[PDB]
Design a protein around this ligand. Structure first.
Ligand SMILES: Nc1nsc2ncccc12
Ligand SMILES: [Mg+2]
Lengths: 152, 150
């Protein structure tokens, strides 16, 4: 594997470990991974981090009742670019009515970019992904990992 | 100048975070590298290389979280790493009521020119370690004077 490929693999591992921990504890989370459509306008709404990605940092960001926990984390390649970012809310009727603002923000950004967003529900611990305007719910750990590996 | 504005913004981020921690009696340990290189201690932690903000500093030190045990080390105006190991002082001249956070701060200050800021989890008191000494029960103004002097 090239260094770029190894680094990607270390980022996926960090992301999946953090999401798995938060799902178990019902820690709400909203994590958008920038792809080929630039997310600069949404990164500038948040607190800048420009940090190396770790499972530990991702977890600490989303602990309830803390300064960084509300809003989205936006990742650019192997960095956490910013936290507490604003994303636009989708009006799609295919978002389950019981879902709150994190899921609607995730679908929202996914309608205007090619990003992949991961959502952990604070109600149920369920893991979802928003991509291309669609929300995919109740993901197993394996499903999520495969989704991330496919996103490369 | 830009460098001057950056240093002031960093001082202001740190003091805001420390004041929030002190109010809530959240234990914290924040070392600022100076001329003596601290790469061997930075290596023991989780790498961040992150922009400083009061928000990030607070999120790092929340109790019962992955990053809260150990020291934050700052270098070149950025958070280099969190959850870092610092050497425990063996000095017999530290207040006997204090524990390992304060002895770690004094320890690193014995072997480097760094400045360490400590928030006590018992009292919310704020102290600074430098040159082997611990300066206790600092006000906000006192801490800012220390940072500006440094
Ligand atoms: N040896 C240490 N390095 S950081 C820290 N924090 C609390 C107690 C000990 C230590
Ligand atoms: Mg299903």
């Amino acid at each position: 594997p090239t260094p770029v490929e190894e680094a990607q693999q270390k980022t996926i591992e960090a992301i999946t470990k953090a999401i798995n921990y938060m799902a178990k504890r019902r820690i709400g989370a909203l994590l958008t991974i920038e792809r080929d459509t630039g997310m600069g306008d949404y990164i500038e709404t948040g607190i800048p981090l420009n940090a190396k990605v770790s499972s530990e940092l991702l977890i600490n960001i989303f602990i309830p009742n803390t300064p960084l926990h509300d809003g989205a984390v936006i990742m650019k390649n192997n960095e956490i670019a910013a936290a507490a970012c604003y994303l636009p809310l989708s009006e799609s009727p295919f978002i389950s009515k019981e879902l709150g603002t994190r899921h609607r923000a995730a679908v929202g950004i996914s309608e205007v970019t090619d990003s992949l967003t991961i959502i952990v529900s604070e109600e149920t611990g369920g893991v979802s992904v928003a991509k291309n305007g669609d929300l995919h719910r109740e993901l197993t750990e394996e499903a999520l990992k495969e989704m991330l590996e496919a996103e490369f």
